[PDB]
Amino acid sequence: TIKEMPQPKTFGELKNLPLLNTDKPVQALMKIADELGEIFKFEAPGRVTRYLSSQRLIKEACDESRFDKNLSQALKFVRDFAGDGLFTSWTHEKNWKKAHNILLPSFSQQAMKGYHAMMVDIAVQLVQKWERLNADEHIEVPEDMTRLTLDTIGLCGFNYRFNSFYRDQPHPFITSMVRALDEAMNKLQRANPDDPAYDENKRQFQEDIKVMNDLVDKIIADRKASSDDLLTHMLNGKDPETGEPLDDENIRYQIITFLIAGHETTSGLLSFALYFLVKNPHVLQKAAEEAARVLVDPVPSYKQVKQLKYVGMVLNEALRLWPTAPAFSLYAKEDTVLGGEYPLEKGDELMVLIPQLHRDKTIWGDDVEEFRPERFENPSAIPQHAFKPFGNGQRACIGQQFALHEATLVLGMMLKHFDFEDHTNYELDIKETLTLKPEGFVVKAKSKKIPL
Numbered sequence: 001t002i003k004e005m006p007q008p009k010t011f012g013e014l015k016n017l018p019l020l021n022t023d024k025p026v027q028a029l030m031k032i033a034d035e036l037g038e039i040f041k042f043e044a045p046g047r048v049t050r051y052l053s054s055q056r057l058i059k060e061a062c063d064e065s066r067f068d069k070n071l072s073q074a075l076k077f078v079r080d081f082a083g084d085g086l087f088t089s090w091t092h093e094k095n096w097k098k099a100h101n102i103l104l105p106s107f108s109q110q111a112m113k114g115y116h117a118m119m120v121d122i123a124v125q126l127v128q129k130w131e132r133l134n135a136d137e138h139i140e141v142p143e144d145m146t147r148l149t150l151d152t153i154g155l156c157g158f159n160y161r162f163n164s165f166y167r168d169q170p171h172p173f174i175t176s177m178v179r180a181l182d183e184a185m186n187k188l189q190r191a192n193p194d195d196p197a198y199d200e201n202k203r204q205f206q207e208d209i210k211v212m213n214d215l216v217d218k219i220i221a222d223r224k225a226s227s228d229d230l231l232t233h234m235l236n237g238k239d240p241e242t243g244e245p246l247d248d249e250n251i252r253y254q255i256i257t258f259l260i261a262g263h264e265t266t267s268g269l270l271s272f273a274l275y276f277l278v279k280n281p282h283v284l285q286k287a288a289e290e291a292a293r294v295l296v297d298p299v300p301s302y303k304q305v306k307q308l309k310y311v312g313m314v315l316n317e318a319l320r321l322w323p324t325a326p327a328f329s330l331y332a333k334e335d336t337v338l339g340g341e342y343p344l345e346k347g348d349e350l351m352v353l354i355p356q357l358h359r360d361k362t363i364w365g366d367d368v369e370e371f372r373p374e375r376f377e378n379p380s381a382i383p384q385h386a387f388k389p390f391g392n393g394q395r396a397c398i399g400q401q402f403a404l405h406e407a408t409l410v411l412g413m414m415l416k417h418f419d420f421e422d423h424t425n426y427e428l429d430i431k432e433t434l435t436l437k438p439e440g441f442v443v444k445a446k447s448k449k450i451p452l
């Protein structure tokens with residue numbers, strides 16, 4: 001009944017801004033939501049946003065007639081290099097619907113069947129790497145998952161080989177992208193971004209943007225000198241509405257977007273999935289049993305991957321507890337009241353805190369912190385807008401099918417070929433680069449000695 005909104009602790013003139021002066025801002029906002037509940041106001045000089053954590057309010061926020069996708073401050077900083085690519089465009093910019101129409105067919109069932117062989121090429125490189133480890137050598141999990149996911153989007157999307165399994169260090173692309181993301185996350189807490197103490201930060205940022213754009217003009221130059229892949233559709237496809245193709249500036253932004261959006265979160269998903277599987281041995285056993293039963297050939301087929309149902313549920317349960325793109329932003333299209341209590345003005349910003357949404361006890365029950373893939377047996381038994389790891393509506397993840405096909409294929413092959421040991425009894429440490437990923441997660445993989 002027009003309730004007053006809670007607000008976390010303030011720092012005078014800086015309002016709530018210093019609460020983001022941490023290497024783990026999403027984990028900080030989750031603790032605030034635990035303390036303040038389903039909604040709280042966050043204020044900095046010149047800006048306000050309302051953090052939502054309950055399925056009760058988020059099911060309203062997901063009404064596309066009332067709320068559209070907002071560029072959060074984080075996405076405004078990413079737009080410095082991702083421009084009006086699909087992830088960092090407003091819905092009302094011409095290039096959003098145009099690129100959407102042109103690129104959606106690059107995620108058709110026909111398209112996924114076409115990507116499968118190249119996903120297998122990279123997955124086989126991962127399995128061969130682990131088969132070739134010596135006694136008592138370990139696996140650096142997020143490092144190897146990032147090698148796989150970057151190489152997969154490079155090859156499937158652009159017929160480009162990053163060759164990440166030939167490198168003991170990350171590809172220059174990854175090093176520059178991680179630093180750009182870390183700069184973008186860093187600028188969020190930065191009062192007085194014009195301070196000369198940040199002139200080197202700016203210089204380094206521009207440098208990192210130059211590294212990713214050099215690789216893009218090279219992917220483009222490569223293709224020019226001679227495929228039916230994502231890059232084919234970017235260069236040739238026409239929007240059925242206008243009959244127009246994408247312009248060169250936009251195409252560059254889409255390549256940068258798909259290299260970032262198309263691997264970082266999938267590497268996080270695979271890393272968290274393997275973390276929960278080694279921490280939950282009964283779940284690991286059930287998934288390994290399915291992989292053994294289904295993947296009866298040396299090379300997995302598209303159809304077999306579609307039959308790894310329990311592996312698919314493991315991936316959804318990992319996205320429930322640690323959604324690797326952990327927030328999305330909305331703005332009110334008009335004046336509206338939220339849950340009958342919180343009046344909003346046109347333009348008012350909302351932040352969906354996805355990990356908190358996924359811990360709503362009124363949806364999942366009291367065992368909400370438990371890793372239980374069986375929660376996903378029946379999508380009709382899950383309330384509306386309870387599970388939002390790929391965002392909402394027409395602005396939902398275009399790459400969800402690609403990511404889940406790749407992750408199901410790879411996790412299936414991992415569970416078929418190896419037994420895993422949590423040999424250090426790893427303590428979860430979640431590194432934030434806007435996206436979430438376990439840091440320092442290592443395992444030992446004992447070969448089942450099954451040939452490829």
Ligand SMILES: CC(C)C1=CC2=CC[C@@H]3[C@](C)(CCC[C@@]3(C)C(=O)N[C@@H](Cc3c[nH]c4ccccc34)C(=O)O)[C@H]2CC1
Nearest residue numbers: 020025026047072073074075188189325326327351434435
């Ligand atoms: C690539 C995808 C997965 C991402 C989604 C994100 C959504 C919200 C972000 C993000 C998690 C990074 C950390 C801050 C946070 C939680 C945020 O709300 N920030 C708000 C509010 C804010 C924080 N600091 C600010 C400084 C100035 C202005 C606004 C802000 C914002 O960025 O808009 C960020 C990471 C990148």
